[PDB]
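Q: Joint fold for the lines below.
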Amino acid sequence: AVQQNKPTRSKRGMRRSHDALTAVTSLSVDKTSGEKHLRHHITADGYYRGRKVIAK
Amino acid sequence: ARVKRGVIARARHKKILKQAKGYYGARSRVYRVAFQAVIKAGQYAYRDRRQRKRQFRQLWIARINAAARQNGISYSKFINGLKKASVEIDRKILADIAVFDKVAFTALVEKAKAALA
Amino acid sequence: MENNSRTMPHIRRTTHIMKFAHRNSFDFHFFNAR
Amino acid sequence: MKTFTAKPETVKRDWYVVDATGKTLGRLATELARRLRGKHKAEYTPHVDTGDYIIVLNADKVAVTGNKRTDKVYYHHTGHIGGIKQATFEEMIARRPERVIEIAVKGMLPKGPLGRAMFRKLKVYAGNEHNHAAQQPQVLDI
Amino acid sequence: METIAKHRHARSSAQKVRLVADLIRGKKVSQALDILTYTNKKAAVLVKKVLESAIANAEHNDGADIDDLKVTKIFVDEGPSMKRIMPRAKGRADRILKRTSHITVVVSDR
Amino acid sequence: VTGSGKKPWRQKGTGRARSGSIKSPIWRSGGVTFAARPQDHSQKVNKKMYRGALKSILSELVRQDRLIVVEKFSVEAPKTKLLAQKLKDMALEDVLIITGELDENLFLAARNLHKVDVRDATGIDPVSLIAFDKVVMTADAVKQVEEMLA
RNA sequence: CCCCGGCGAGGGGAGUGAAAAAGAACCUGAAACCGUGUACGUACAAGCAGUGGGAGCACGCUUAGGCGUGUGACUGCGUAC
RNA sequence: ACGGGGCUAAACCAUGCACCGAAGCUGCGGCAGCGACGCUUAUGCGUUGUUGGGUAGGGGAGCGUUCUGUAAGCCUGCGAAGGUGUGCUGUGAGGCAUGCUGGAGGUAUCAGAAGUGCGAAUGCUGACAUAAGUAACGAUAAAGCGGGUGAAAAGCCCGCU
Ligand SMILES: NCCC[C@H](N)C(=O)O
Ligand SMILES: [K+]
Ligand SMILES: [K+]
Ligand SMILES: [K+]
Ligand SMILES: [K+]
Ligand SMILES: [K+]
Ligand SMILES: [K+]
Ligand SMILES: [K+]
Ligand SMILES: [K+]
Ligand SMILES: [Mg+2]
Ligand SMILES: [Mg+2]
Ligand SMILES: [Mg+2]
Ligand SMILES: [Mg+2]
Ligand SMILES: [Mg+2]
Ligand SMILES: [Mg+2]
Ligand SMILES: [Mg+2]
Ligand SMILES: [Mg+2]
Ligand SMILES: [Mg+2]
Ligand SMILES: [Mg+2]
Ligand SMILES: [Mg+2]
Ligand SMILES: [Mg+2]
Ligand SMILES: [Mg+2]
Ligand SMILES: [Mg+2]
Ligand SMILES: [Mg+2]
Ligand SMILES: [Mg+2]
Ligand SMILES: [Mg+2]
Ligand SMILES: [Mg+2]
Ligand SMILES: [Mg+2]
Ligand SMILES: [Mg+2]
Ligand SMILES: [Mg+2]
Ligand SMILES: [Mg+2]
Ligand SMILES: [Mg+2]
Ligand SMILES: [Mg+2]
Ligand SMILES: [Mg+2]
Ligand SMILES: [Mg+2]
Ligand SMILES: [Mg+2]
Ligand SMILES: [Mg+2]
Ligand SMILES: [Mg+2]
Ligand SMILES: [Mg+2]
Ligand SMILES: [Mg+2]
Ligand SMILES: [Mg+2]
Ligand SMILES: [Mg+2]
Ligand SMILES: [Mg+2]
Ligand SMILES: [Mg+2]
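A: Joint structure:
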């Protein structure tokens, strides 16, 4: 099965009206480093919720 | 004597696509679709120069009929009374007085009622 | 034979692709208007 | 000179109340369709709604002639297969009497977005009472 | 003062980069760097290096300050496509397009 | 066109417009449909039409004051500077010189002047009698044209 | 030569030049096609998408007003080559 | 099985007067063809009658493009051709002027010669769309972790399973 007519650039942009990305709103600040991180994730320097959890 | 067609064919295509502005989709971009749409727009315009005269007389008569019934007479008796009273005002002007000068329209109705009675 | 194809130089006989009676899944019951 | 065109922001609409007791259905509906369209005004424009607001009282007491109280049949389809449904005039009066005048006027109005906006000015009531006293409707003895 | 950085012939399609560039349009550049850090896209790595290079262009070549900058324009254009050949069944040959993009990031304090 | 007479693909089946030759004029690098040959563009003029046209051209040169008749038209040395000086003294710049039979000094002295043609009475032609502004004939050459034109 | 970048790719300055939007993917740089910005329209509305009529809005004018440009609510007619 | 709403006439028959209704006819303005008569033409103007839907097809008159002569002329770095807008103009094919771009060619007039005009041919070549960020990523023998290197390691190196 294939199209009988070429769909337009209008119809193509209507289908892509749900393809947009969601930006993350939730950057937490760790309470002893001051570093930003995702919620319930560790920091880049290896802290989580105030303590050094990974010695990396 | 070899003739290249680049300059002449480009000017001919650009002339059609200038007349196809405001049209939807490929009708304003693509020459095969735009040329076809400019011809149909010219057939409609030729036909509607005749239809414009029909639609305005239709609008004048409907307005004369409404303002004459405000004075107790229909359209078909008001036209017959004005022809009997030798009044030669056309339907464009009658429908214009019926909107903008309502007591001058009342004077024409009383003239038409007198010629019928 | 198609001897100087520039889009498909690797193949010379291509009618087994698009002609319906020359495909491997052609059945002669499709030709029942006899 | 170009012919006058009514402008929809400065059009004057007025309010009327009509009593449908003992009126013939279609002969009442033709006059309601004129005034919702604005055919009775000299400022009539075919693309502008220049009509009036009309309240219709006592829709359950409208009259038909002949044997049409038992023989006039209203049909509709539901969109599901085998879904043709019918109702006589007597059943439309007993169940939902305002629809009888609303269906009759809707067929006499133009079809399109302007005719649907002309229909919105019709207010039909089954009884002798309306609650539009703040708009001060004029009695239209039609 | 307006400041441009560009990545021309970036190896990805323009439709994929434009999803990421619409995230940071109009934003302050400190906010826009954080959005790109936690976006799990390959195009978010590409757009971040052009935004970082536009910030450094504006403070070195124009003497601007980093806390004032905003992303005022951002747009992706299509680049040249590379033509590859993909074999299919029964001797068929398809053409693959490998699409590229031109990323343009524009920063200004005004 | 260089190329073979092989049919490029088969007649039926491939789903594509039929072909018979790679050298077809529809195709890129094909032949020219009505390709040209070397041809001879010369026309025939009747003898009485040619001589009748020269008399009309000569009569207009008298009528439009474009004909000049002289006893002698010679230069003394084959020097271009002499003829340019001589024509300056007659207010002639674009001029055709027709003489009885042609002098060797005058032929060499006019070879570098692009506005000056120097001819004998035999080698005249209808276009040069119109293309030049003034025509200077010697009295010996005027009589030779009449025997030429009966 | 300086800066961002992986001692990248690519870019921003600086400099050469009449010109660098002549930068080596290089004279001119059309069209299909794809974007960013702005004005107006568009979420009760049915069809070759125009045409005839026509409100409102925006920007220009120039005035004791109503013209120009863009858009086109609503409405008559209208089944491509 | 009235086009619909609806209609006891808004149906049918008979008579009568109004009105609506087409690109038909009339009014006003304009263009052209063919006759007839003339301010007199030199082949054009004036008056008048009439005509002007059109396929196959026949007849008549033109526009524009490249090239040759006129042209060792004319225009042009104080900006040519080409590209892109705007304005004016002709019954039409078209023409003229000018802003921006471009950076060195262009060409009146009257004649001459044609590779002289494209939307169609499942036309030919190049470029770019659509489906669509969809199907698929090539044997269902299978991977897990620690360390190293690196801008970055599920896939590389080392080790143990
Ligand atoms: N003799 C074998 C030739 C194979 C060729 N590539 C073909 O497609 O015919
Ligand atoms: K050969
Ligand atoms: K250039
Ligand atoms: K373009
Ligand atoms: K319309
Ligand atoms: K120019
Ligand atoms: K074609
Ligand atoms: K796609
Ligand atoms: K596999
Ligand atoms: Mg091979
Ligand atoms: Mg395969
Ligand atoms: Mg194979
Ligand atoms: Mg096919
Ligand atoms: Mg050739
Ligand atoms: Mg001979
Ligand atoms: Mg010479
Ligand atoms: Mg300069
Ligand atoms: Mg420079
Ligand atoms: Mg040059
Ligand atoms: Mg270029
Ligand atoms: Mg361009
Ligand atoms: Mg709405
Ligand atoms: Mg609804
Ligand atoms: Mg009917
Ligand atoms: Mg009449
Ligand atoms: Mg008419
Ligand atoms: Mg008519
Ligand atoms: Mg007529
Ligand atoms: Mg005709
Ligand atoms: Mg020439
Ligand atoms: Mg030219
Ligand atoms: Mg220009
Ligand atoms: Mg040709
Ligand atoms: Mg073409
Ligand atoms: Mg054709
Ligand atoms: Mg190419
Ligand atoms: Mg190519
Ligand atoms: Mg494709
Ligand atoms: Mg799908
Ligand atoms: Mg799926
Ligand atoms: Mg899958
Ligand atoms: Mg595999
Ligand atoms: Mg593992
Ligand atoms: Mg590991």
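Q: Anything notable?
A: Chain D is about 30% helix and 20% strand. Chain D has one domain: 1-142.
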